[PDB]
């Protein structure tokens, strides 16, 4: 079901074409090509734009169009730890399934998609804060090590959303972790038409719209 | 049992008419047509003006008028705690009842009214107040992450009140996000007459006021 209107998106066809071109392509190709080339599968994406401008709209639709297990979504900075250390336990409990699957099966495991709402809530300048407790540094470093480090990962996809790309530490943006970046500006006239239609199909279905409109 | 006069608010008839039209229109018509439309109720209202113009009393009376449960009010920044993480835990407990009730019955639950006083005390511009502990930026992120997001809620209504509407977040006042933004202004002569009559009703009824006035 790749209708793209049954799903309900505001004429963002070109956006999806470009994202599939850039990524999700090595994902549907012969592994043998990936051995001759030796190019790894991209595992980082970012979607930012006018606050809630259909920013979570497609985030709530991608979970359907995929023939793998339902992607796990993290809704905002709920990684709270009251005693000591369990913030790093929470961060750990996100990637356990990927580790287990990769150990169980390799080169054909599948994909696991993780979504961080309010990325900006938890990822800021490491040294800027002067607070006595350094929890933010602790979580930032743990996440950095998990996404990138001596240990290798090949069956994950991290997606990040912020309504203000500015308060983000540059270390997390180094090439090889979140190299890809994309913006969602505003809807064209033509896309506005499809939008109106999508937002008015039921209206016309039950004969509640005056022909003058 | 009800009456507009019973409340004892005068001079804001247009304001009440607009509020009722844009807030309570979908909650009074027979369910069949509204359900045939697939429209989501508005769940946001914001008020502001100079002190002593009857903003507090307005919310007091609007809450009292409903045949719903007693509204839960928050008196300024009263949801802060001395530890890491319980600003969010406090801003999150406010929605347990609505979520539970929606999941038990669904589509037939009563409204849940929440009132914030001086919203500007807690919710302000992210990227500002560059002090320490980043708690404010975390609270704002949670509040938005919870008013809207991956989960759906249709039995809530939030009222905010401020005096300096230029310091609130942009998305917090966007569509479906305190979208209705009203403007209470100093009364007119007719408003003055109505007000004086309202505050001089218990006197004429006991012959305690001389007819000379």
């Amino acid at each position: 079901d790749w209708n793209f209107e049954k799903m309900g998106i505001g004429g963002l066809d070109k956006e999806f074409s470009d994202i599939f071109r850039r990524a999700f392509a090595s994902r549907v190709f012969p592994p043998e090509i990936v051995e001759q080339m030796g190019c790894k599968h991209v595992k980082g994406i970012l979607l930012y734009g006018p606050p809630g401008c259909g920013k979570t709209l497609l985030a709530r639709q991608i979970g359907k169009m995929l023939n793998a297990r339902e992607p796990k979504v993290v809704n905002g900075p709920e990684i709270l730890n009251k005693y000591v250390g369990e913030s790093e336990a929470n961060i750990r409990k996100l990637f356990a399934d990927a580790e287990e699957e990769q150990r169980r099966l390799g080169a054909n495991s599948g994909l696991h998609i993780i979504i961080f709402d309010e990325i900006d809530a938890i990822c800021k300048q490491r040294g800027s804060m002067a607070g006595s407790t350094g929890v933010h540094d602790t979580v930032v470093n743990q996440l950095l090590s998990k996404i990138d480090g001596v240990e290798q990962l090949n069956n994950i996809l991290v997606i990040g959303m912020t309504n203000r790309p500015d308060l983000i530490d540059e270390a997390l943006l180094r090439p090889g972790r979140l190299e890809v970046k994309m913006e969602i500006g505003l809807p064209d006239e033509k896309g506005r038409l499809q939008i109106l239609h999508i937002h008015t199909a039921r209206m016309r279905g039950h004969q509640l719209l005056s022909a003058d409109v | 049992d009800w009456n507009f006069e019973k409340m004892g608010i005068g001079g804001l008839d247009k304001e009440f008419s607009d509020i009722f039209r844009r807030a309570f229109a979908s909650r009074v018509f027979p369910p069949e047509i509204v359900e045939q439309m697939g429209c989501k109720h508005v769940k946001g209202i914001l008020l502001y003006g100079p002190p002593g113009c009857g903003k507090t009393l307005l919310a007091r009376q609007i809450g009292k008028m409903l045949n719903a449960r007693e509204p839960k009010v928050v008196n300024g920044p009263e949801i802060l705690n001395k530890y890491v993480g319980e600003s969010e835990a406090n801003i999150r407990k406010l929605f347990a009842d609505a979520e539970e009730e929606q999941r038990r019955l669904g589509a037939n639950s009563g409204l849940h009214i929440i009132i914030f006083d001086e919203i500007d005390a807690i919710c302000k511009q992210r990227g500002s107040m560059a002090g320490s502990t980043g708690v404010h930026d975390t609270v704002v992120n949670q509040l938005l992450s919870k008013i809207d997001g991956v989960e759906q809620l249709n039995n809530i209504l939030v009222i905010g009140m401020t005096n300096r509407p230029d310091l609130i977040d942009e998305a917090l006042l966007r569509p479906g996000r305190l979208e209705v933004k009203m403007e209470i202004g100093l009364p007119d002569e007719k408003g003055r007459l109505q007000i004086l009559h309202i505050h001089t009703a218990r006197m004429r009824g006991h012959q305690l006021l001389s007819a000379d006035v």
Partner: peptide, 28 residues
């Protein structure tokens, strides 16, 4: 002039009172 403070908790599960009751009972 500036600065604010913070606080934190830890895993302690002492319950020395109950352990003291128990061990005293053991002694008797």
């Amino acid at each position: 002039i500036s600065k604010q403070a913070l606080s934190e908790i830890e895993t302690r599960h002492s319950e020395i009172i109950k352990l003291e009751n128990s061990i005293r009972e053991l002694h008797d």
